[PDB]
Amino acid sequence: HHHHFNLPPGNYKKPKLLYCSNGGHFLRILPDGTVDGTRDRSDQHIQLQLSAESVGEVYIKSTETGQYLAMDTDGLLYGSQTPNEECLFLERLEENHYNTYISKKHAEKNWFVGLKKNGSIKRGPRTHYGQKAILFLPLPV
């Protein structure tokens, strides 16, 4: 625990869409395990269920495929078929408004879940505090 502990309000009772203000893309986990972002609100792979394993520590799962959002050893996001240490994220409030997700496994290096303006996933090392890429707003499905 070497990070602040400002947590977002709201809960995990219902699924959500993770909207990235950077380019206005929703986080998407495709059936093949590919992760990206899309602006198409009618997409069936943007509905995500978050669950708290510990206070502030969550899994982010696709309701359509059951895949878990995860970040690999080189900082790339991917969809995992089963839950593992690369699937846990530190969900925190940011700028008193947005939600950010830091890779628990790579928390010491501040690797965040993040989408570039063109909708492509940002690599762990390339993310950092202060970018719009890491800022999410969980919206109702």
Side-chain angles (χ1 to χ4, degrees), residues 4-60:
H4 72 105
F5 207 64
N6 289 298
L7 314 168
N11 52 51
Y12 313 108
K13 295 199 182 72
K14 295 200 186 70
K16 307 277 168 44
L17 303 184
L18 291 185
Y19 174 81
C20 187
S21 61
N22 195 26
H25 297 85
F26 296 105
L27 187 51
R28 183 173 61 176
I29 306 172
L30 301 175
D32 71 342
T34 294
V35 178
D36 68 5
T38 177
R39 297 199 173 96
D40 173 12
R41 306 197 64 185
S42 69
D43 189 286
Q44 305 300 299
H45 299 106
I46 60 174
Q47 295 71 22
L48 311 171
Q49 177 67 61
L50 281 68
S51 52
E53 277 297 295
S54 292
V55 181
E57 278 184 36
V58 307
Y59 280 135
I60 296 170

Side-chain angles (χ1 to χ4, degrees), residues 64-77:
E64 192 52 40
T65 70
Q67 295 182 79
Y68 295 76
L69 180 69
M71 177 172 279
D72 77 19
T73 192
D74 287 314
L76 304 185
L77 293 169

